[PDB]
Every structure is written in structure tokens, then in C-alpha cells.
Amino acid sequence: IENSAIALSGIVSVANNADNRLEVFGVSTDSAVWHNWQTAPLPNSSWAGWNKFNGVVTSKPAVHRNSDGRLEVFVRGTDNALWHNWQTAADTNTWSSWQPLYGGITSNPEVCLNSDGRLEVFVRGSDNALWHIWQTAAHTNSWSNWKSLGGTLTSNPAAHLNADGRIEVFARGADNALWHIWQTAAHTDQWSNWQSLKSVITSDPVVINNCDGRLEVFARGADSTLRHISQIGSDSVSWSNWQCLDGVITSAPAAVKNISGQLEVFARGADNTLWRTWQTSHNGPWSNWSSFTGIIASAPTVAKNSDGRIEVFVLGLDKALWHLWQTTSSTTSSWTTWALIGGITLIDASVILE
Amino acid sequence: IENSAIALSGIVSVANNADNRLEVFGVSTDSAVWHNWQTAPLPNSSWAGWNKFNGVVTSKPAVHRNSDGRLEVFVRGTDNALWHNWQTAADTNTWSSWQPLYGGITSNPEVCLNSDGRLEVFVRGSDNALWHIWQTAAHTNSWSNWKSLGGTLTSNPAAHLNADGRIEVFARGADNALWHIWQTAAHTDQWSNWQSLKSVITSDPVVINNCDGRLEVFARGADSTLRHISQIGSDSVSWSNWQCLDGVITSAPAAVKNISGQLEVFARGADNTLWRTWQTSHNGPWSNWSSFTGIIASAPTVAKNSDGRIEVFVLGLDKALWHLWQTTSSTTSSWTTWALIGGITLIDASVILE
Amino acid sequence: IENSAIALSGIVSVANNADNRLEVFGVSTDSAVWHNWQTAPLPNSSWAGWNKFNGVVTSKPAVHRNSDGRLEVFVRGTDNALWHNWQTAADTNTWSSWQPLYGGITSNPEVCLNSDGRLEVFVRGSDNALWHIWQTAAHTNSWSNWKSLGGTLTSNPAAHLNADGRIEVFARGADNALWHIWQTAAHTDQWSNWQSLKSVITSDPVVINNCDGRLEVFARGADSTLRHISQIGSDSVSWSNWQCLDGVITSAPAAVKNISGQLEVFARGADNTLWRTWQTSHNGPWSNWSSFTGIIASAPTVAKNSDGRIEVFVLGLDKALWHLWQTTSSTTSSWTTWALIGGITLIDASVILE
Amino acid sequence: IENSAIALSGIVSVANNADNRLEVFGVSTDSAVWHNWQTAPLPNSSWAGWNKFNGVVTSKPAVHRNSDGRLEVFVRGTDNALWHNWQTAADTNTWSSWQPLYGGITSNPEVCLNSDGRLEVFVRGSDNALWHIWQTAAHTNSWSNWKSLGGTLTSNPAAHLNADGRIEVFARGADNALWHIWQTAAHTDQWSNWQSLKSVITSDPVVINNCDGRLEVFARGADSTLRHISQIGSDSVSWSNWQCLDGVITSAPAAVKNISGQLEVFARGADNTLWRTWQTSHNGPWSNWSSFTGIIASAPTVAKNSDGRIEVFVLGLDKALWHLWQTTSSTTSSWTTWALIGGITLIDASVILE
Numbered sequence A, B, C, D: 001i002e003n004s005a006i007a008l009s010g011i012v013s014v015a016n017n018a019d020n021r022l023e024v025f026g027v028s029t030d031s032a033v034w035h036n037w038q039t040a041p042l043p044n045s046s047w048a049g050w051n052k053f054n055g056v057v058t059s060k061p062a063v064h065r066n067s068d069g070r071l072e073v074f075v076r077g078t079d080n081a082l083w084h085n086w087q088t089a090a091d092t093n094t095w096s097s098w099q100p101l102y103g104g105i106t107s108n109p110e111v112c113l114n115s116d117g118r119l120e121v122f123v124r125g126s127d128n129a130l131w132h133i134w135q136t137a138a139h140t141n142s143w144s145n146w147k148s149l150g151g152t153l154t155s156n157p158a159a160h161l162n163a164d165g166r167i168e169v170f171a172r173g174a175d176n177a178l179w180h181i182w183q184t185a186a187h188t189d190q191w192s193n194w195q196s197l198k199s200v201i202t203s204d205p206v207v208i209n210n211c212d213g214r215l216e217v218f219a220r221g222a223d224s225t226l227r228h229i230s231q232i233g234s235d236s237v238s239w240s241n242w243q244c245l246d247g248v249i250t251s252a253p254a255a256v257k258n259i260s261g262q263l264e265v266f267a268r269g270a271d272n273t274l275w276r277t278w279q280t281s282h283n284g285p286w287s288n289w290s291s292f293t294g295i296i297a298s299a300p301t302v303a304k305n306s307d308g309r310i311e312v313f314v315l316g317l318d319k320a321l322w323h324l325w326q327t328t329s330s331t332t333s334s335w336t337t338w339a340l341i342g343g344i345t346l347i348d349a350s351v352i353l354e
């Protein structure tokens, strides 16, 4: 592969409502965001049906739950600015409609919830730097001015909280390596300088926390295999060496922590089916990749239900949304086969970065 | 000690608001519930001042955050029934005032949030059985009728979610041993039979989840030392043997999981000071107890701030509330000395069980 | 129990030959040491038959393999001095007969192999202090003079190597607590002062190393339950708190590390049957005790065969030696039932310490 | 690199004597084996001086300690047959001189000690299959006839015991992948079929056991980085996926388990200096490679001293043997700088496999 490739992304963004019902957000052929939700917080639930938000959008939507349980969606508009819309009350299907946050956006938006309850949004700006904007009070439609964190980005940003409440942001840099920058005090506008984690990545970075607190980062490497790196101390400075796992993947990875505390990674494999690998013991070795039947046309998007069961969403060859899930709350559970969440077809609205 | 002793309890109940500010609830000499909160979600924050809820109460208050971020407090009233009051909006100091849930209550109330967003309350009833009542919709003032789970209780109940979303309830039985009962499917009114975990306990049980998912239970034993037992499988049936730790304790324990994923336990020690022990490695051996300066007159109540720092509340010999906290987000952090949260004096309103 | 009780000991000492065949040493009704060995290094092997060493002895024999593979046995003689005899070549049943090491001995002897290949023997002397004597060259019948390490002993000593090659010795002191003393440099006559590990023990201490390097010590406590303590650092100074396991035991424990690296403990239980407990995960919680059919009249002595399978020796009610073993090299293996190693009856020749 | 490359090997074979003194074996410019030993079992000991064994050899020597403590060396002779010579007594510098074992050898010999005390030798034969021969009684100069295990080898074989006593042998196959074959019962001539572990390796395999029992295998991969794979069950069939570590290495790796039970790997790095990586926690992530000053001309050979301290041997640019070691028995110890073990120069006598 080209060292500047960005692997295929997931086709929807997912969130858990305040009652843990899953709700998915995607872009249809009308260039509008449509959403659909479980009617009860279990993977075998029926889904409500696809519902449209009026308005044309020009990026993949990002969704996050506010600290008062209301979902809020962020998306680039036809004016290349940032727009958002929110549930007006937790677990209710009444939304505010799109409202402006301005700026000039050249990536998909990324959203993170600070540990003091304030949402914060990260984007690549018109100068290819990292910019951000935040709620000035928890779960309130009152936002800061736009501010730059500098750098040069060549991927979408990925943000995650450290165990001590400090946001850390990861992104590919101008040298195609993974860089990162972090708050030096929790939920405060005081940030480090940019630092390189060195390698070469060919996907957006994917970040998860392990049970020990520590962040782990997953990405596709230059040889098209999964690689990963982890924090080895109590700060954002001390990291392991990179490790790669054998097996060519053809999409971004998606990572999840199962209810036994072990990590699992899902990715589209070299044969265009869904592949899965899991840690066999704590911090442990990784299993050989296992394959699920069925050709898929996007990266997976992963979520967990109220009972811990993992559920995976993909685009099918018919350009509709399919999903499968674990049959039991159990690391060795069998899985269902792909089922259709029918009613619309989806397009990949991800911002083209070059 | 007597095998039917119940060790001294904590003097306040604490919760984190939606923005993670700590808020404490206690009973003053007027037999009313008073509360106080941090003005910002950090341990060195100033506190707002003690504010009264009108109404006379006859138990320790229990508090839990709803899935929409609103705090809700439960307490026994002068009529021996259950009463509750709630924040009318997340992170706001406007409350509903006490509203009735009826029933007949002979213990302190215990509250648990189901993984489908519904609060559920557990109490000992007038027949000494375990009774419960629940929200019929997530974060809504719409409640079920009272229902019995049977048994015979001689302690307050303690409830916790398993990793798969099933509530499990622990309580001392008529033989002074620890018993438990559990949902057999997550957030459903389908329950097991009562089963004994065998020993003899002389405090209320204290339950926490470890990073591996598994529940761990802590209690004082018949020889006045801390003992503990843990789940060793993926279900509620398979448990370890009990282990005891040397050192006489003179209150209920309080347990917390620090931001490195290790467990710590706090208790009033044999010299009436606060003692602390921590796991030195994963699942590991426990440290010798360490002592903090200062005589204390209750069990500790423990909480974590937005930046991970642990904070401990106790009754002082002056009958006021004192607290101390970690200076840094770090397992080996030093601690502050006791500081006063002045303005009222507190009484122990715990229901007397015999 | 009395705080100065010493629990019942094992009836034989066992060693692995250079080819890993098990060989057992015990004292018969003629007050002579007799031995018997496997004919091949597997638990289902036939045994050779009981063979006598000429000479009357007055303690339990201790056996250790030299660094050149020759077994060597140590025992107190009718003159209260230390005697030894050795295989004249590895894996051969030709022995030297008893030869004198003099001194005055008031405990059973304890033997440890230094990491420079020299045997070293620890005993309580006529002044109740700890004394020792060592080979001055590896696997050579050339010994030092007797030297005192001081202290006051009220149990037999137990010695074990730390991971860095320093011998550490454990023994009950005059206050019935567990004390210890250690080499400050590996395989050198340079020793620490005595230090207390505090509790009260009612058996000889039993010491094993875990996979992490660290020593763990097991003993019966004042309430007749198993207790244990472990090193938590890289030196001999830093230890955990003591923990107890529920369940009354009526003999010394015996500990072994199974081939998955987890610890298992065997002891005679409160019903006079053999009980077993194992660590369920690394450093983990301990299982409930499991019982084997059959009344036993000594503590267990445990060993491992060439294929990893655990084998347990006990005195039966007929005063003969019985054993059972794992059917497969596997932590969850089933076990055989007791089988007789017939031909002599055994007596407990342990030195009476008070 | 070429997929059929075999990376540069270590220049000496090392063993611990019965008293744990290190002794090294290498080939000098006269094509004879010379050896040198520590005079005391500590890394700062003086060495005795280089001593010659008479006889011309045509492979790297392999050395193993017998179960009676006597070292024994194996080497290919001028007739392409296998020869051996042994210490006539443990810890003594009197040797038997070279004695014939016949056969026809096309690799370096590899030696393994069965858990019943019998040495067993593995070689590639004249038909490129794996052949072996064994002692028919423990630590005795009585050997079996040569027997074939089949296969097709394109590297030297590497043998290691599983925790249950079964020998397992690893070697590169005709497809440049790593293959293996194993005893199906401990120390018995009953073997599995050959099975592939799949990848492509460009060094001999290096095998070590972890504390959990399980084997781990390290090799250089097709992209010249270190890769590794581990057993994930209790048998020889169940393995993890392969993982690679970033960093180009230019020699075979050498692995050792330090006294805290963690693995460390040493290799010549891309800048021709010695590099080291270690596991930061159990099973854990690996550290970034650290470099030692000094250009080296072979792979490292690693050993541990009687006090646990790691010591590393390499060929220097002057064609002599150099070594360095840890200053303390401690995972975070500093290291010495290279010191010369002077008196002869060494050649790489490894059999050229293509």
C-alpha cells in the first residue's frame, strides 16, 4: 500500500442512549443523516425504522452522549462549517435540528466527553492544524470560541480520556507517523506539545483504555497489518514498542473491551470478510484471526448492549446496513449471522483528506 | 464480638453529580437531611455550604444518580414508609421535595441502577424479608408496586450489578451468614433462589467489581478482621473461599477501585484511626494496613473525583464532617490531613436492626 | 488450640533422584531409616521395596539431592549429634552408611542447596539458637565447622533460596511468632539480623517460590486455619499482610507449584481427610477446600513426577505409607484413590521441641 | 532480505557447571574447540584461561549438562559424523576426549535433557530430515541407534521441554516456514506428525518457557524484525497468532527469563550494536529496544550467573570474545561495558546449510 493511504472507515456512528439502547447514524443517498434505534436495549430487539434529519451534510456524523444522557450529533455542513443537533430530552426522539458552530472543517469531527461533563470537539482545520471547541458548562448549549492546537494532520483525529481525566488526541502527521498531544491537567485548556510515536500508519488511529487504566492504540501499518502500542506508565510520555499482528486487513480496525476485561479487535480481512481477534489472557497474546461468513463493504463499527453482548455493524454489498451479535454474554459465545436493518441505503460521506 | 453485631456505618452517603462534583447527604440534630456539594469537581474545591431538605427522617439516606444525571435520594419517613426526592435537572440545586413510595421499611434503603437505566430500591420489610420496587421507565417518576423476594435479613442489603447487567443482592441472614440472590437475566424481574455464602459476618456487606468483571465482597468477620470473597467464574454461583486479613477493624469497610485498576479498602482500625490497605498487584496480596492521624467516629465513606483522586469522609469527635484526599492522581500519592466541612453536626440515623 | 502447639508433620521425606525417580525416607518401629523408590519416574511405576539403613536414629530424616545428582540424608543420632549418608553415585542404590557431623541437635535437620552447589544444614542447637554447617566445596564430603546464627527457636527451621540465590530461613520464635533471617549476599556467610513477621503460628513454616521469584510462606495460625504471607518486593524486607483461608486444618500444610505455575496447598482437614486448595488464577483467590476419601494419620508430603504429575504421601490408619496421584499432567486432572506402599510400618520420629 | 537467509549465530555455546560456574565453548583458527570457565560463579570472577581440546571440528559445538552435573559437548567431525566428549566428574577440568557417535550430520547439533535424565541429540541428516539419538540410561555413555523423524529442514533444529516433560522440536522447513514436532508422551520415543506454524523465518528458532509453563518461540522474520508466537493452552497444538516487534535486527535473537519471571530478548541491531528488549509486565508489552555501546560481530549468547545476574557474550571486531553483565540482581540494574576474555581468536564454524 501507499504510506499515505487511509483505510476504509465505518459506515455509521453508534451511541448508547441513556437507557443503553443502541442508536446508529449514517448518511443516505440524499446526503442527509438518517438514524435508527433499538426499541429495547437488547441485540435481538426490533428497530424503530429509519428516520431523517433534514439538511445536507458533507462528512461522516459523530455522536456522543452528553452527561445528562442526551445524544448529540456533529457533522460538517454544505458551508464546510460544523453543525450539531441534539435530543431535547434523554431517551426521546425529539431533536433540536441542526444548529451552527461555524469554523472551517477539513476532516470528520471527533467528539470526547471531559470528566467534568463538558463535550469537546476536535477537527482538522483549514490550515490542516488541529482545532477544538468545547461546551463551557456541562451538557449546555453554550460553547467556547474556536482554538488551535497546531500541528499538521493527515488523518482524522481520535480522542480519548486517560484514567486521570486528561484528554489525549492522536492523529497521523505530515510524515505519516502517529503523533499525539494531551491535556496536562484534567479538563483544562492546558496542553502539551505534539510528540511523535514514530511508526507509519495507513488508517485513522483507534484508541481504547484497558482495565489497568492505560491507553492502547491500534492502527493499520505500512504493510497492511494491524499494529498496536500501549502506555506503560502513569503518564502520556511512556509507551511500549510497536507490535504488529500477522494478517492483512483492508479496513480500519475497531476495538472493544469485553465484559471479562479483555480486548477484542474487528477488521475487514484480506478476503473482504469480517475478522476478529481477541486477547487470550490479560495483556496477553492475541488469537489467530477468525472470519465470519459474508463479504462486507466497510470497516466494522462495534458496540455493546445493556447485557454486555457485542454487536457489529457493517455495510453490505447491497449498500444497506447489516449487523450480527453474540448469542450470550460470554467471551466464547457463538455469534448470529448477518441480519439486515433495512429501509435506506448508505453512502460513505467521510471527508476526503488529500 | 457478638456474631449478630453490625459494625458502625458511614455517616454520609455520597454521589457524583452529572459533572462529577461530589455531593454528600447526612442527617443533622433536627432529624432532617442536609446536603453539601463541591463547587467544582476537584478535591481542593470549596464547598457550597450545608442546605436543608424540609422533613423529618428515620433512616440513613441513600442517593443514586439517575441515567439522565439527576440525583435522587431515598429515606425512611416518620411513618416508616419510603420517601424520595430528586434534582429537577442535572447539576442544579432545585429539588422536588419528599414524595411518597409507601411500603413498610425496617432497614436503610439500598439503591441500584439497572443497565437499562431504571433505578431499583431494596429494603428489609416489616416481615424481615427483602422487598423491592423499581422505576418502570428509565429516569422517570413512575414506579412499580412493591414486591417480595423473600428471605430473612439481619443486615442492610447491598446491591451491585454483575458485568452482564444482572443485579445481585447481598445480605446477612438469620444464621448470621452472608446470603445472596440475583437476577437470572439482566434488568428483568426474574430472580434466583437465596443461597448461602456460609461464613459469619458482623458488618453490612460491601460489594465492588474488579477489572476482570467479577464481584468481590468485603465484610467484617466474627473475629473483627476484614474478610473477603470473590466470584471466580462468569456466573453468580462460583465463588472462592473466604480469606481474612490480619488487623482488627472497628467499623464497616469501604472499598474503591483506584485508577490503576487495583482495589483499596478503608476502615476504622483498632486504635480508632482510619486505616487503609491496597492490593499490591493484580488480584494480588494485600499491603499491611497503614494508619492516618486522627481519631474518627464513623466508618469511612469513599469517593473518587473527576481526576481520579480518592477522597474520604468521616465523622469527627466534634460530630462534624471531615475529609481528606490524595494530593495527586497516583497510587503512591501522599494524602492531605483531615479538613473540616463545617456548618452542622451529624447524627447516625441508621435503622437499628434488632 | 494452644499458641505453642506444633501441628502434626509429614511421615516421610521425599526427593527426586537425578533421573527424577521419587525416593522416600521414613523411620520404622526399629528406629532405623528405611527407604523405597520408584523403579521408573512415573506415578504408576512399581516401587522397589523397603530397604534399611543400619543405625538407630532420633529425628525425622531430611534428604536433599547434591548438585552432582547424589541424594544425601541427614538425621539426628542416638548421641544427639548430626549424622549423614549419601549415594556413592547418582541413581544408584549404593550408600556410604552413616558418618558423623557432630554438634548437638534439638530439632529435625533442614537442608538447603546453595546456588553455588554447596549443601547447607540448619538445626536448632542445644542453646535453642539456630546453627548451621555447610559443604566447603560443591557436592564434596568436606564440611565447615559449626556456626551459630543466634535467635531462639520454638519450631523446626525451614530454609529456601530467594531468586537471587540468597538463603532465607524461617522459624517460630520465643513469642510464637514467625521470624526470619537471610544471607545478604548469595551463598556467602554474611547474614542479616533476625526480624519478626509478627503473627502467631502453630505449625512449622512452609516456604515456596512463586513464578514472579517471590517467596510465599504458609503456616497454621492460632485459630487452626491456614495462613500465608508473601514477599512483595525484590528483597527480604518487604512483605504483604498475612491472610487466612477459612477451614480448620489439623496438620502442617504442604505446598507445591503445579506445572501451570499456580500454587496448591494440601493439609489434613478438620475431618481428618486430605484437603486441597489451589489458586484459581495468578496470585489469585484460593478455591474452596476439596476433600479426598480416606482418614489419614499424618500431614501430607507432596512431590512432582518427571511428567509434572503431583503425588501425595501420607500415613494411613494401619501405620503404613499410602499415596495417590494425578491421572494426567493437568491442573483439572482427576486423582487416583489411596494405594499402599507396603512392607513396613512407620513411626513419627520428629524431635519433640518442648 | 532473502526469505531463505539464516541470520548470524552466536559465536560460543555456554553452560552452567554443577556449581553454576559459566563455561564457554568456541572454535579457534586451528579449527579446534577451546573452552574457558569462571573460577567462581559470579560475573566479576576471573576466568581460568583458554584450554584446547585436541581434534579438528566442522560445526559449532553444542554443550549440555548431564543430570549428574557433568558437561558434555557435541560437535561434527572431519568425517561429518557426530562426536562427543565429557567431563569425567562434575566441576572438574578432566575430559574424556572426543568419542564417536557416527551418523551423517548436515547441521549443527542440538542437545536436550529429557526429564528422566537422558540426553537426546537432534540434527539434520544427510537426507535433510530430522534425526536423533539418545542416552539409553540417564547420564551414561550408552546410546541408542540413530532414528529418523522425517521432515525437511532448512535451519538448525531447536529443542525444548514442555512443562509436562515432552520434548518439542522446532525447525525451518522447505517452504521457509516454522515447523514443529513433539513427543506425545514425556521422555518416550512416540512422536507427533510435523505441523506448520506458518510464517516465514530468517533465523534459527529460539525457544524459551515462560512461568505459566507455556513455550514461546522467537525468530527473525522476512522483514528482518523480531517476531514471536506462544502456546496458549496446555498442549502443543494451540498457539497464538504471530506478533512482530518494530526494529530491524541483524542476528539471531537470544532470549532469557530474568529472576522476576519476565522475558528479555537480546539481538544485534540494525546499527550492529547489541540491542535489548524486555517485557514490562507479565505477558506484557515489550519495551523499546535499548542499545549498548560497541560494534559486535556475532549474535549474543546469554547466560545467568548463580546470583541471577545476566551475562552476555559476543564476538568483537578484533575476533575475540567479549562480555558484559548486570551490576546487580535486579531487573533495572545498570550494566558493565564490554570486557575482553582474551587469549584466542574465534571463528564461526556453523554448518553452512545451503
Ligand SMILES: C[C@@H]1O[C@H](O)[C@@H](O)[C@H](O)[C@@H]1O
Pocket: A054, A055, A056, A057, A076, A077, A078, A079, A083, A098
Ligand atoms: C447541516 C446543515 O444543513 C442545512 O440545511 C444547510 O443549509 C447547512 O449549510 C448545513 O449543511
Ligand SMILES: C[C@@H]1O[C@H](O)[C@@H](O)[C@H](O)[C@@H]1O
Pocket: A102, A103, A104, A105, A123, A124, A125, A126, A127, A131, A146
Ligand atoms: C476550525 C477553524 O475555523 C476558523 O474559522 C478558521 O480560521 C481556522 O483555520 C480553522 O479552520
Ligand SMILES: C[C@@H]1O[C@H](O)[C@@H](O)[C@H](O)[C@@H]1O
Pocket: A293, A294, A295, A296, A315, A316, A317, A318, A319, A322, A338
Ligand atoms: C454482509 C452481508 O452478507 C449477506 O449475505 C449479503 O446478502 C449482504 O449483501 C451483505 O454483503
Ligand SMILES: C[C@@H]1O[C@H](O)[C@@H](O)[C@H](O)[C@@H]1O
Pocket: B054, B055, B056, B057, B076, B077, B078, B079, B083, B098
Ligand atoms: C420524609 C417525610 O417528611 C415529611 O415531612 C413527613 O411528614 C413524612 O412522614 C416523611 O417523614
Ligand SMILES: C[C@@H]1O[C@H](O)[C@@H](O)[C@H](O)[C@@H]1O
Pocket: B102, B103, B104, B105, B123, B124, B125, B126, B127, B131, B146
Ligand atoms: C415494603 C413492604 O411494604 C408493604 O406495605 C408491607 O405489607 C410489606 O410487609 C413490606 O414491608
Ligand SMILES: C[C@@H]1O[C@H](O)[C@@H](O)[C@H](O)[C@@H]1O
Pocket: B293, B294, B295, B296, B315, B316, B317, B318, B319, B322, B338
Ligand atoms: C478526624 C478529625 O481529626 C481532628 O484532628 C479532630 O479535631 C476532629 O475532631 C476529628 O476527630
Ligand SMILES: C[C@@H]1O[C@H](O)[C@@H](O)[C@H](O)[C@@H]1O
Pocket: C054, C055, C056, C057, C076, C077, C078, C079, C083, C098
Ligand atoms: C545414626 C547413627 O547410627 C549409629 O549406628 C549409632 O551408633 C550412632 O550413634 C548414630 O545414631
Ligand SMILES: C[C@@H]1O[C@H](O)[C@@H](O)[C@H](O)[C@@H]1O
Pocket: C102, C103, C104, C105, C123, C124, C125, C126, C127, C131, C146
Ligand atoms: C550445633 C551446635 O553443636 C555444638 O557442639 C554446641 O556447643 C552448640 O550449642 C550447638 O548445639
Ligand SMILES: C[C@@H]1O[C@H](O)[C@@H](O)[C@H](O)[C@@H]1O
Pocket: C293, C294, C295, C296, C315, C316, C317, C318, C319, C322, C338
Ligand atoms: C488413607 C488410607 O485409606 C484406606 O482406605 C485405609 O485402609 C488406610 O488405613 C488409610 O487410612
Ligand SMILES: C[C@@H]1O[C@H](O)[C@@H](O)[C@H](O)[C@@H]1O
Pocket: D054, D055, D056, D057, D076, D077, D078, D079, D083, D098
Ligand atoms: C572431532 C574429531 O577429532 C578427531 O581428531 C578427528 O580425527 C575426527 O575425525 C573428528 O573430527
Ligand SMILES: C[C@@H]1O[C@H](O)[C@@H](O)[C@H](O)[C@@H]1O
Pocket: D102, D103, D104, D105, D123, D124, D125, D126, D127, D131, D146
Ligand atoms: C544421522 C543419520 O546418519 C546415518 O548414517 C544416515 O544414513 C542418515 O541419512 C542420517 O544422516
Ligand SMILES: C[C@@H]1O[C@H](O)[C@@H](O)[C@H](O)[C@@H]1O
Pocket: D293, D294, D295, D296, D315, D316, D317, D318, D319, D322, D338
Ligand atoms: C564489543 C567490543 O567493543 C570494544 O570497544 C571493541 O574494542 C571490540 O573490538 C569489540 O568490537
